[PDB]
Design a protein around this ligand. Structure first.
Ligand SMILES: CCc1ccc(O[C@@H](Cc2ccccc2)C(=O)O)cc1
Lengths: 270, 270
């Protein structure tokens, strides 16, 4: 029944909104869009950041650059904090996906453990454009150029996410679309360690049919878009893998410090 | 028009028959040990490998190989030959894809360059089953176990293909299906370097439409096969990567091993 898919599409969309503060419709308005009623603090240099941390509303540390930790490190770590927030938002979202909670708890955890990273770069693209990503709930805008001027290890961290985003945003998907796409990602039946795949693929099968209709009705002139969106998952996977690869390198930089025990603890690997 | 799409399916399936001597249909006919019109000799150990040169067309060594390229070298030097064989074949199938020959020559080359191996492993699955894979146009069958027991490095070149094949063959796809899917793989667009992506995406778009209808008509009861298949493209990707790494590793461990030209040109780094 197309009444079930259309229903599901709306459902997920409703939960996506109630779960994700910064939506693409929003982030778009702030970005390249106009909407001149409140402009984001731009960060394009070692000064913008400095003269922007004490001013903006960030959670980690105050702006101080004088032989006290490196700017890059404080930035990278900022991503962690925010992603950890994201993981929480996503975890609540999956909970609204029909059948998700009725699954083995060990599977839910597994489905989340591996889907969180892919869902994160998918949405980050909602906040990105060719020249930078919105920052701090959208209060800021760290340029893409400043990110590349970062330290040797941290300067090639967001580029692959920028290139992904640039091609991804070309599909011109709106939140109602990403809502179901994000659902398809969580209900991935190929995650290592699952104990009962049948129910996981049944849900995804259902989500896939839902995405297909949503896209056809939402983009009648966009040909075989369903196909293309499912193809960007290969990029997501490479974006995710490549990320753990640049993570180990970072792990081969900062380590032993008897002050991190509790902070390093809050940050596992997702 | 469905007629136009069905026409293109027939066309591609037709060239598929014309460019690949060993179709999945023949392979399964051989693998399902019933049609004894011609059964395969099985390789599951050295002794069998020896008797391999016997009733199978081989221009390699028959007796001992310790003092003349061990078993692993014999198996993979042969595996290179088939790969080149496979590329050439796909290069032929490719020219038959409506439009491919009309694209910028450079793109043609780039499409084959990244498309070649994804297709090889796709079709390679047609010759596989949980316990092994067919060799020498079907005349032989080398055990997955013999393969996994090869010398430290070589020992793990095939296992990941087998893992892919078991999942992929699960879709129970047939030749006419792989035909449109093999075309969809070549006509990508995200291949690194392509000059004109639009003409390429316009074709793949058509191929995708052609693959969708086919799957519906051919597998009515198989829900979401189109998408499940399209997601297998991610699986293929990673495999190519695992392959390149191992390859890069052999180049060092075996200074005497010589990758084939048509294969070195295809392969690069990063
Ligand atoms: C002799 C080293 C080697 C070369 C190629 C190779 O894989 C083939 C492809 C292949 C792999 C396994 C069965 C058939 C073809 C390629 O990289 O073109 C594996 C090992």
């Amino acid at each position: 029944e197309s009444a079930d898919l259309r229903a599901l599409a709306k459902h997920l969309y409703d939960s996506y909104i109630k779960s994700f503060p910064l939506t693409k419709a929003k982030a778009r308005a702030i970005l390249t869009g106009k909407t001149t009623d409140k402009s984001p603090f731009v960060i394009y240099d070692m000064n913008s950041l400095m003269m922007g941390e004490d001013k903006i509303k960030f959670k980690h540390i105050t702006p101080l650059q004088e032989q006290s930790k490196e700017v890059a490190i404080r930035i990278f770590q900022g991503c962690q904090f925010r992603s950890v927030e994201a993981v929480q938002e996503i975890t609540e979202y999956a909970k609204s996906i029909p059948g998700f909670v009725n699954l083995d708890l060990n599977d839910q955890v597994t489905l989340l453990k591996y889907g969180v990273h892919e869902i994160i770069y998918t949405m980050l693209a909602s906040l990105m454009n060719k020249d930078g990503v919105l920052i701090s709930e959208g209060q800021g805008f760290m340029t893409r150029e400043f990110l590349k001027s970062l330290r040797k290890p941290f300067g090639d961290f967001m580029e692959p996410k920028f290139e992904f985003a640039v091609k991804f945003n070309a599909l011109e998907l709106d939140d109602s679309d990403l809502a179901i796409f994000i659902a398809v990602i969580i209900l991935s039946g190929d995650r290592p360690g699952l104990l009962n795949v049948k129910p996981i693929e049944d849900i995804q099968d259902n989500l896939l049919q839902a995405l297909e209709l949503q896209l056809k009705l939402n983009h009648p002139e966009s040909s075989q878009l369903f196909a293309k969106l499912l193809q960007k998952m290969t990029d997501l996977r490479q974006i995710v893998t490549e990320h753990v690869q640049l993570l180990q390198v970072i792990k081969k930089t900062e380590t032993d410090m008897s002050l991190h025990p509790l902070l390093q603890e809050i940050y596992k690997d997702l």
